[PDB]
Amino acid sequence: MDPMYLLVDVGNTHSVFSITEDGKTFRRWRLSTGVFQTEDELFSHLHPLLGDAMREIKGIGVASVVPTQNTVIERFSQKYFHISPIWVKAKNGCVKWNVKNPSEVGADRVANVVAFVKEYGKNGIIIDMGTATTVDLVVNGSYEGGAILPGFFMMVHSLFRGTAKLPLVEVKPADFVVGKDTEENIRLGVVNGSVYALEGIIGRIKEVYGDLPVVLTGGQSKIVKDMIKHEIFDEDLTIKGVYHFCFG
Amino acid sequence: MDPMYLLVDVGNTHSVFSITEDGKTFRRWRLSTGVFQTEDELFSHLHPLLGDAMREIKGIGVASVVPTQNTVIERFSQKYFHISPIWVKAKNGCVKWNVKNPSEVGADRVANVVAFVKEYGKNGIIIDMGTATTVDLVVNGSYEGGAILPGFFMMVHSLFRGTAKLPLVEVKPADFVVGKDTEENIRLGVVNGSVYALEGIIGRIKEVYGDLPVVLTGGQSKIVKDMIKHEIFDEDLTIKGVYHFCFG
Ligand SMILES: CC(C)(COP(=O)(O)O)[C@@H](O)C(=O)NCCC(=O)O
Numbered sequence: 001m002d003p004m005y006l007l008v009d010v011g012n013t014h015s016v017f018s019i020t021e022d023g024k025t026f027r028r029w030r031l032s033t034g035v036f037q038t039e040d041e042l043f044s045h046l047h048p049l050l051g052d053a054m055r056e057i058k059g060i061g062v063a064s065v066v067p068t069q070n071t072v073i074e075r076f077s078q079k080y081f082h083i084s085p086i087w088v089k090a091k092n093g094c095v096k097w098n099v100k101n102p103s104e105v106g107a108d109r110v111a112n113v114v115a116f117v118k119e120y121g122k123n124g125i126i127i128d129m130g131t132a133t134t135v136d137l138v139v140n141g142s143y144e145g146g147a148i149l150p151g152f153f154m155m156v157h158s159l160f161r162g163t164a165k166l167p168l169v170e171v172k173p174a175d176f177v178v179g180k181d182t183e184e185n186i187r188l189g190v191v192n193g194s195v196y197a198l199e200g201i202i203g204r205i206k207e208v209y210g211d212l213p214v215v216l217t218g219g220q221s222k223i224v225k226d227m228i229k230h231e232i233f234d235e236d237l238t239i240k241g242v243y244h245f246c247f248g
Numbered sequence: 249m250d251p252m253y254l255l256v257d258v259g260n261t262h263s264v265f266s267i268t269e270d271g272k273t274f275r276r277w278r279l280s281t282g283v284f285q286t287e288d289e290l291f292s293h294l295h296p297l298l299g300d301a302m303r304e305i306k307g308i309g310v311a312s313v314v315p316t317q318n319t320v321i322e323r324f325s326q327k328y329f330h331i332s333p334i335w336v337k338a339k340n341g342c343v344k345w346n347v348k349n350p351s352e353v354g355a356d357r358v359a360n361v362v363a364f365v366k367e368y369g370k371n372g373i374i375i376d377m378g379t380a381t382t383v384d385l386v387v388n389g390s391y392e393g394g395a396i397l398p399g400f401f402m403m404v405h406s407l408f409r410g411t412a413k414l415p416l417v418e419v420k421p422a423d424f425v426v427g428k429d430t431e432e433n434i435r436l437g438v439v440n441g442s443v444y445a446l447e448g449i450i451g452r453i454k455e456v457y458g459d460l461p462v463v464l465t466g467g468q469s470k471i472v473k474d475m476i477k478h479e480i481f482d483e484d485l486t487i488k489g490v491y492h493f494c495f496g
Pocket residue numbers: 010011012013065104105106107108109130131132133134148411412413414429430433
């Protein structure tokens with residue numbers, strides 16, 4: 001009566017695997033996405049993590065932003081569970097997609113919007129801090145578009161690889177107004193700076209659309225949770241959206 | 249007389265070569281920095297550009313943030329001009345250096361501060377939009393530190409290389425509150441976002457140090473000059489600093 005579902009969020013750096021028996025409580029694991037990985041390699045990684053739960057999975061739902069990985073997920077589902085996964089995509093129904101090319105919207109973003117409309121309301125701004133940081137706007141149940149920024153690690157890594165002199169700095173907020181050494185300069189510019197970037201984008205949105213609730217999610221969100229004004233902090237938002245899209 | 253000086257600003261992507269006979273007006277050229285270049289290669293590039301001026305250079309001053317390039321500049325100066333270049337670095341004198349390790353401050357930043365204190369006064373905030381975007385604070389003739397952010401091109405390139413689905417986008421401001429396609433999303437997050445990031449960092453500096461004049465400079469600054477509030481726009485700031493540091 002409470003069948004188990006596996007929800008997958010394939011990101012550029014990491015993939016999230018979650019199981020639920022009700023779509024209300026979720027157990028989560030995370031693995032590297034890994035370029036040339038196979039279906040057997042995925043099973044091998046998941047086996048000690050899911051344990052007994054493995055053989056209880058009755059459906060698999062996936063949001064993926066890495067097309068090359070999709071055949072691996074497909075083969076894994078078919079080989080180990082004798083089912084095909086259900087793929088999150090922008091489509092008509094519960095959300096109206098008021099953008100130029102809805103098919104080009106990343107599946108994670110689609111999942112976030114679906115979860116938002118299902119669980120939170122018809123109006124809101126979603127901030128998802130991952131490999132990239134995204135802003136997504138929903139007004140009266142219509143997706144209106146958003147913004148894409150490099151994520152925190154992407155930023156510090158870009159400064160490292162892209163200059164002769166700069167080191168790779170740890171992602172940690174600055175508790176100072178000006179940096180007094182190179183590492184501090186980078187923390188201020190990247191971490192606090194990205195926070196200000198987001199607050200400026202959100203502010204301009206709210207000028208046009210009013211005081212919408214802000215939800216924060218993503219693998220890199222906890223570090224700056226207390227620096228961005230938000231009404232909701234929901235680390236499971238994407239997985240919930242995968243669940244709602246695939247299994248209602 | 250009015251002897252001619254060559255000023256060099258060696259950056260991570262490009263190097264600026266400029267001549268002046270008075271330290272007020274500059275003729276400038278830009279070349280790629282280029283990893284494996286030699287002194288003869290540099291001379292070959294500069295020959296058709298400087299023309300007769302090559303014969304007239306009496307002094308060479310350099311700010312470099314690419315240490316591997318420094319031997320090329322040294323050899324070029326010695327072979328073609330029979331002189332050693334003068335190297336911009338942080339040292340005590342007309343600027344006090346109120347940071348933990350002044351010797352680590354990039355030579356371009358040092359040059360910017362020197363130029364600022366010579367021409368624009370004892371107090372200011374310098375924004376240099378280059379490969380990286382820097383903020384530098386000068387208070388009562390003392391360098392206080394700053395911030396470092398990825399530059400615009402660095403950001404869009406990082407999104408392109410760091411994800412499966414994102415294209416390489418042209419750097420241009422967003423003219424809209426949310427993006428309605430991928431390109432527009434990235435312009436909003438990177439260009440408008442970085443402007444907001446800078447304004448937040450600068451706003452917080454001003455809360456502590458007062459409303460100091462802002463100077464804007466750098467190879468990527470023109471595209472956003474009508475978007476960032478500034479008292480001074482001076483594309484020659486770094487080269488001016490090289491001149492003042494080396495030749496007064
Ligand atoms: C912007 C993203 C890279 C975020 O992905 P992630 O941080 O999850 O790896 C992804 O949503 C994506 O590839 N989007 C396609 C472009 C778009 O949504 O406009």
